Structure formats: C-alpha cells, structure tokens
Symmetry: C3
Subunit: 115 residues, 3 copies
Amino acid sequence: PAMFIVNTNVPRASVPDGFLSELTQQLAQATGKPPQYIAVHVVPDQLMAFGGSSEPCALCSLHSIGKIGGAQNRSYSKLLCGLLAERLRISPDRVYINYYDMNAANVGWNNSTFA
Amino acid sequence: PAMFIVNTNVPRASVPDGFLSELTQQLAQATGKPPQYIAVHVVPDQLMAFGGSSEPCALCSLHSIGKIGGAQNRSYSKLLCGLLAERLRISPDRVYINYYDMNAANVGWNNSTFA
Amino acid sequence: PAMFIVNTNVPRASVPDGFLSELTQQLAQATGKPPQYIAVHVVPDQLMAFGGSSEPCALCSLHSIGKIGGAQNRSYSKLLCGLLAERLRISPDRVYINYYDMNAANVGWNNSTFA
C-alpha cells in the first residue's frame, strides 16, 4: 500500500485530465505494488510560498509500507518531479516530497490494519 | 492530545450535521483522552483516486501522544471505518488511516510543547 | 530545508496580506536556514473542531531536516502561536503544531533527495 499527496498553488483548471490515473500507474510501477493499493490525492489552488515566492510550487508526501530508501527515494523524486514539471509546469527546484516508510501495524484499512 | 483528519472526495453536502462532534466523542472514548484534547478536521470535495477509481474513498491520519499500538490501531480502524461507512457511505476497503505516535516534545500547544 | 503548514477554520479574508512572507522570514530566522529553503502553506476556511468547539483553532506541522528538539520546538511554538494569535486571532491554547525531524534521504527536491 502507498498514498501520494500533491499540494500546489497551480489552479484546478491547469490539472490535466488523466493526471490522477497517470500518478497511480507510474507509482504502482515505481514501487512495484499493484495499482489496487495505490491511493492519490491532488490539492490545487492552494495558498503557498516556496523560498518566499508564490510562483508555481508543490509540497508532496509519499507514505508507503516499505519500498522507501536512499536510492528508491531518489528515483521517486526524479519520476515525481518530471511529472509535475511536464503536467503542472512546476519547476523541480520548487518541489518538496516527504517520504515515509510506514509500519504495517500503523496503516488501517478495511476495519483492521496491515499488520 | 490527539488529532484526526479525514480527506475525502465525498461532497460537503453529504457530511451530516454533528459529524465532527461524533468523531470527537468516539475518539475521546476510544483513546481514553478527555474530549478537550481531541481535535478533528474533515476535508470533503477532494480530487482523489483509490486503486485507480474515483468512487467514494478516504485518506486519514490520527496523530496521538501515546495510545498507539498494534491492537489499539486495529480497534481505531474498526471504529473509524464504521463511522465513515455509516456517515459518509464510504466502503471500508477504500479507506487508509495512518497512525502516528507523537513524542510529547514534538507537539506544540499554548506557546510551548507537551514535554 | 523546512516546510510549515497551517490548517485553520479562520476565513480566507481574515488572513492578512504578507502573512506567508512573514511566516517564511520568521521561520528562516528561527531555524537558521536561508529563506530560499523555507516553504509555507496556509489553508483557511476549514471544517474543524478543537476540544469539541468550532471557535478559531489551528492544526499545524513543521517538517525540518534537523533543527528539531525539545528546546527548539518550545521556542518554535512560542513564535508560531504568537503569530497565529496576533495575525489570525487564534488563541494559543486552540493550536497544535506537530514537529518532524526529517532525514535528508527522505526529502525529495529537484529530481533527487537531500541525502
């Protein structure tokens, strides 16, 4: 299981059709998890500043049970920044992505947890 | 102290009156913390996908100073999924809840922290 | 690098001009990090309750690579609560701020991570 959130000041109208599906597919592929387990959340029109500037930016999070590590996080960032640059026109240097390796016992789903 | 956030694609109009109060009471009861210390945040109308589908779903978080564990998280999930299913018509298998056991020194409140 | 989020039920119109810039500067100063590395996100008009009440409140997070600790978090809360009280008219005792000391390998930026 893995969840990805994108918080951005880019307007809703600038989020292309298929964006959530593309994120789901690329992340399923990158983490090696079936897409059924990937959840995505996009939050446009946000009041944000990066480095004191209000030009396009994004603050993201990827919580995943496993598949988190030095090298994996580097490829995730390359993939994720490429997508935000191409799709939302956000410069890679105006993006932060926080990675969290979740313990299965700390992720609830379907009336229980993954423990 | 504990805080609970629900991010959902369910429309605002579908959130019943008293929903936040019910969450506050059930969580105070479940964690065994006075309700004065429970904070709740509900965020409807979100652009989300779960397993690649945009049917009703929810991504939630419960940050709590203590009261986090294998068995406790399982009961929290049963309680929380039951509420989302009954109140927001969200299927329990389309819900993720991330649990965080916060250190008191890492939770600020009233100009200081709980350390 | 550090990121700060404020989630509040205070209306958008009550957020003064320059609020995001002030937060950026105060946080750069407080953490001793150049402002270029500080990201800020303010989310008004939220459906929230604190202690069961819907009076003005805020649930915040400060994720920082380092500069997180018992004493530092205490000054951060004093600074942050002072700002929310003065700027948004939020009582310090109706504010929670969760502090996260992020590992550099778990923060992506500009196609890679800070590792």
